[PDB]
Amino acid sequence: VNYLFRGPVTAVAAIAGEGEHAGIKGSLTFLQKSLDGRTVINGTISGLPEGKHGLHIVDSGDMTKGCYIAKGHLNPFNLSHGAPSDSARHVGDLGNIYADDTGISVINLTDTVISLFPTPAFVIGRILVIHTTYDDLGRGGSPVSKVNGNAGGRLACGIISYV
Amino acid sequence: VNYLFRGPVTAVAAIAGEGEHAGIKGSLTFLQKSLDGRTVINGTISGLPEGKHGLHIVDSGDMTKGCYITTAKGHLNPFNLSHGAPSDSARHVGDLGNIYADDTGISVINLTDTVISLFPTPAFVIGRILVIHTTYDDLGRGGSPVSKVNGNAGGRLACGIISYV
Ligand SMILES: [Ca+2]
Ligand SMILES: [Cu+2]
Ligand SMILES: [Cu+2]
Ligand SMILES: [Zn+2]
Ligand SMILES: [Zn+2]
C-alpha cells in the first residue's frame, strides 16, 4: 500500500514569532487515528498578546522568507471562510485560540476536516498561522470576512510536519 | 482528482542553524514535474565551514526541540536499505550525498535525484527534516561502524522542514 495512508498519523508544528514577536513560542501535536477519524490538536503557545487570535492553515508551506511575508487559507474545496464548526469553511479554518494576561494559550481542539493523510485536505507541509487579532468566523460583515475572517497580520507560524 | 498527485510540484526547505551556528542560513527548492519524474534540487547556503557536508533527509519532521536534538532518529528509509551515495543501488531515500561550501562559506547546491518524491508515494519527502551535517558523508565506504548507517557525517550544522511552496 503506502505507509502514508496507514495506522495512526502523528504530526507536529513548532510555532515561533520573529523580530518584535520573537518571544512567541509553542508547539502543537496533531493525531488522527484513521482516514475517517477526527484529528485531535493539543499544545500551548506562550508570549502572545492577551485576547483571541485566529488560527489558520495557509495554502503555502514556504518559510524561506520568514513568517511576515502565497497568501490564502488552505482551500482545496473552493469554499468561503467560516468557523471550524461551519460546513462552509476552508480546510485551514481552525477558528480562534485565546491567550490570557499570562500570554499563554492552551490549545485543545478536535477537527473533522483537516487530514494528516494525503487526501485533498492534507495539511502536512503547510504553515499554521497565529493571527494578530481574532477571526470573525465570516460573520463580521467586513469585505474580507468571507475571505479570511479579518484577523489581521501574522504573529507567529510553523510548518505542520511529521513527528 | 487529488491535487497532491498532479501537475509539477515545487517544495522548499528554509535552512537555519542555531546557537553558535546561527550564521548558517539558506534555502533549497525541489521541483518534480510528475510521478516518477526526476526531482531537481537547487539552492544556496551561506555561513558554512569550508569543505564537504552530508545532505540527508531524516525520518522525522519534528523541529519542536530545534535542529540539535538528542534524538538520533535515522535517515528516511521506507525501503529498509543500507546507507549509500545517491547513485548507489543500496541507499536510503534520504541519502542526497554531499554539498560543498567554499572558503567564503557559500554552498551552491545543484542536485538531481530519482528516488525522492514530492508526491504522496512511498518515497514522499515532504514534512521531513533536511539536515546539513558537520562533515562529509563517506557514502557508506568509510569502514566506520556507522558508515552503512549514516555515512559517519557527524552532528548537524543546520536543518529545515521540506514543505510545499
Ligand atoms: Ca523513482
Ligand atoms: Cu488567516
Ligand atoms: Cu545523515
Ligand atoms: Zn479561511
Ligand atoms: Zn542514509
- Quickly list DSSP for B62-121: --TT-SS-S----B--TT------TTSSS--TTEEEEEEE-TTS-EEEEEEESS-BSSSS
* Of the partner residues B4, B127, B160, the one whose CB lies closest to the CB of residue A162: B127
Question: Element (H or E) spanning B29, and its range?
Answer: strand B25-32
Radius of gyration of chain B (CA): 15
Whether the Cβ atoms of residue B2 and residue B121 lie closer than 8 Å to each other = no
**DSSP type of residue B47:** S
- Measured distance CA(A29)–CA(A16) in Å, rounded: 15
- Measured distance CA(A97)–CA(A134) in Å, rounded: 8
- Measured distance CA(B8)–CA(B14) in Å, rounded: 20
Report the DSSP beta bridge partners of residue A150. none
C-alpha cell belonging to residue A72: 490564502
Structure resolution, Å = 2.2
**CA–CA distances in Å: residue A133 to residues A89, A141, A159, B134:** 19, 16, 20, 42
User: For the stretch A2-26, what's the b/e string if a residue is b when 16 or more beta carbons lie within 10 angstroms of its beta carbon?
Assistant: eebeeeebebbbbbbbeeebeebbb
- Measured distance CA(A53)–CA(A132) in Å, rounded: 6
| Residue B22 at interface with chain A, using a CB cutoff of 8 Å | no
C-alpha cell belonging to residue B101: 561550501
Question: Element (H or E) spanning A40, and its range?
Answer: strand A39-46
Using the Cα atoms of residue A85, residue A86, residue A87 and residue A91 in order, give the sign of their dihedral.
Answer: negative
Residue listed under C-alpha cell 498519523: A9
- Measured distance CA(A94)–CA(A102) in Å, rounded: 23
- Measured distance CA(B72)–CA(A14) in Å, rounded: 19
Radius of gyration of chain A (CA): 15
Read off φ and ψ for residue B40, nearest 5 degrees.
-100, 130
Residue B63: which of B109, B18, B125 has the closest Cα? B18
Q: What structural domains does chain B harbor?
A: 3-164 (2.60.40.200)
Q: Would you list which residues of A are annotated within the binding site for Zn(2+)?
A: 73, 81, 90, 93
Cβ contacts of B34 within 8 Å, gap of 6 or more: B8
**DSSP type of residue B21:** G
Single-letter code of the amino acid located at B109: I
Q: Looking at chain B, which residue has its C-alpha nearest residue A67?
A: B14
CB contact under 8 A, B12 and A62: yes
- Measured distance CA(A110)–CA(A94) in Å, rounded: 9
CB contact under 8 A, B164 and A120: no
- Measured distance CA(B132)–CA(B104) in Å, rounded: 17
C-alpha cell belonging to residue B146: 556507522
Name the method of structure determination.
X-ray
**DSSP type of residue A48:** P
**DSSP type of residue B136:** -
Report the DSSP beta bridge partners of residue A108. A42
